[PDB]
Structures are given as C-alpha cells and as structure tokens.
Amino acid sequence: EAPNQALLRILKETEFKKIKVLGSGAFGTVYKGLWIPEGEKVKIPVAIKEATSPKANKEILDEAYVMASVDNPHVCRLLGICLTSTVQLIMQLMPFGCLLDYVREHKDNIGSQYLLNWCVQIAKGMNYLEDRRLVHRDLAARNVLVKTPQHVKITDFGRAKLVPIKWMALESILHRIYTHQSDVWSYGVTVWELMTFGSKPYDGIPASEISSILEKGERLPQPPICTIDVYMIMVKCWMIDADSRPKFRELIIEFSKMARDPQRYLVIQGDERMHLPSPTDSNFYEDMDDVVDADEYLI
Numbered sequence: 001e002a003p004n005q006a007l008l009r010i011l012k013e014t015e016f017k018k019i020k021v022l023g024s025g026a027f028g029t030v031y032k033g034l035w036i037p038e039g040e041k042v043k044i045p046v047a048i049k050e051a052t053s054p055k056a057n058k059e060i061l062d063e064a065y066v067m068a069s070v071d072n073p074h075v076c077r078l079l080g081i082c083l084t085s086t087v088q089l090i091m092q093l094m095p096f097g098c099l100l101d102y103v104r105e106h107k108d109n110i111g112s113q114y115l116l117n118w119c120v121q122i123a124k125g126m127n128y129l130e131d132r133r134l135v136h137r138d139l140a141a142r143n144v145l146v147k148t149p150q151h152v153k154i155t156d157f158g159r160a161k162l163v164p165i166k167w168m169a170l171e172s173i174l175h176r177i178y179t180h181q182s183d184v185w186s187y188g189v190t191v192w193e194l195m196t197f198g199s200k201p202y203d204g205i206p207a208s209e210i211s212s213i214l215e216k217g218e219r220l221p222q223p224p225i226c227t228i229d230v231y232m233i234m235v236k237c238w239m240i241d242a243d244s245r246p247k248f249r250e251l252i253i254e255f256s257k258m259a260r261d262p263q264r265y266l267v268i269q270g271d272e273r274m275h276l277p278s279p280t281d282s283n284f285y286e287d288m289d290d291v292v293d294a295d296e297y298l299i
C-alpha cells in the first residue's frame, strides 16, 4: 500500500523547558512544558511524555510512529521526539486534561450543545483514523483530551494498529478481533461516559463477568439526560453483528442534526444558562508574549 511519508522531528533537549509535572504512572511521567525552536521567536505550550529497558523504548517508539503519521483537527499529532538517555515524546499541551475528568469536574456547567458537539468531534476524529486505515483499540473518555471546552481531540496510540474489557466489542473479548466497527462499540461506551457525566461502565461488576453479561443481551443503561433518540444510537453501537453497528460517517451526521437543536435530544436542568471558559474570556490563556499554539505552528 501507500508509502508513509510522515516526518519524524528530532528535537534538542536545549530547545524546550519542563515547567511542572502533570501526572505520573507506571509508563513514566508527563510534564507541562514550553518548546522554543531555534531563532523562531515562538513559545509552543507542550506536553512531554518521558528506567531504560530496550522493550519499553520499542513501545514508546511504536506510539511515536503512529502519532507522527496523523494530521486531523480532532486527533493528537506528535510534535517531535527528543533522543536523550530516557527518550521523550513532545506533544501538544491540552490545557483542560482528559474529557472523563472534565465532565466529572464540570457537570453543573455542561449543557446539551457541548455534549453533542463533543460526540460530533469524536466521530470526526474516529472517521479520520478509519480513512488512514487505523484501528485505535483503546477509545474511551480518558483518551479524549480537551484543548478548549469547545475543542476535543482523540489520543493514546499505545494500542493502535492497521486490556480494556468494559470498552470492548464482544468479538474483541472473545476472539481478539479488532475492526473499525469494534472502535464503534468503544465509541458507544465513550458517549455513555459523557452522557452520565463520567460514570464507570458496569460499576461493581468484575471484568470476567462482562463477556457473559453482553452475551445474554444486557447493555449499559439509558442515562437520565438521554432521550430515546440518543440512547438508540448508543444501543446500535452495541449490536453483536459488527456490520449492523453505525459507521463513523453516519455518527457525524446523526449527532450534527441533533447538535442543531440540542434541547430536543438531551434534557439537562439549567441548560443554556450554563457556561464554560472560552477564548473570549478575561485571562483565558511567565512571558505570554510570543506563545503560539501547536495548531498554528507549522513548518
């Protein structure tokens, strides 16, 4: 098939500054930082993902490969890699963190317009991955990052090709089959995570029971804010027949029609009177002088 002519940018350690730590786990640690290229007079807000074991490097270099091979407004691109002893991925700073925590922390100000717009954006990013013949294998609200409350992007290409049980299609749990239609099942679950304001799917149920639960005909419940219109979409993503499930191009269309009249499809008390931070807010955005967002920094 088509040659992957993507450019892998190697960045010097001296070209960027680590400001603070954002979060640490088993993988390593993600830092908040600034990238100041050559003599460009720009400061790009960045996220730097950083023991050295040859196996862990192959995994991070596999994620770098996939992340450098994407370009879409609703997908996180790799800005570059820094080849130190540790080896670190330089990514775009998504100031508002993951969507999962965002919905939990801001339920009182999240309205129908935002929720439906987020669904359209995830469908667009996912449909792009399908175009690039990329199967995510780990879509969830934790892997959708917030640039601004009005702009979200899909991330975490650590599992992407060409285990998270409660987000998986039945063919995936039973046979390890992953298609773009299995990403649709995970898309259904992600929507459920948003519509419930960050609830844990199948809370209290052990992952081993999930396979048998789905086989019986049981699915995630109808969230209180969901009309039968929105829930019907969730249910269709959870059909046994993968070809029966909607295609992402149909999900973009479905959620877009709904996003034109949000109150008809989602019932939230206090809707329209709610508000989230916007680039039209007082002090929404050290030396703020020459900072440009990665999306406007092109070479």
Ligand SMILES: COC1CCN(c2nccc(Nc3cc4c(cn3)cc(-c3cn[nH]c3)n4C(C)C)n2)CC1
Pocket (backbone or CB within 6 Å): 022, 023, 027, 030, 047, 049, 076, 091, 092, 093, 094, 095, 096, 097, 098, 145, 155, 156, 157
């Ligand atoms: C370990 O897996 C990594 C895979 C890549 N992913 C990513 N991808 C693209 C951009 C990006 N930037 C990015 C990631 C961020 C934040 C800002 N910008 C803030 C947080 C955070 C806040 N409180 N706790 C954490 N995080 C998390 C997800 C590490 N982060 C971050 C997680």
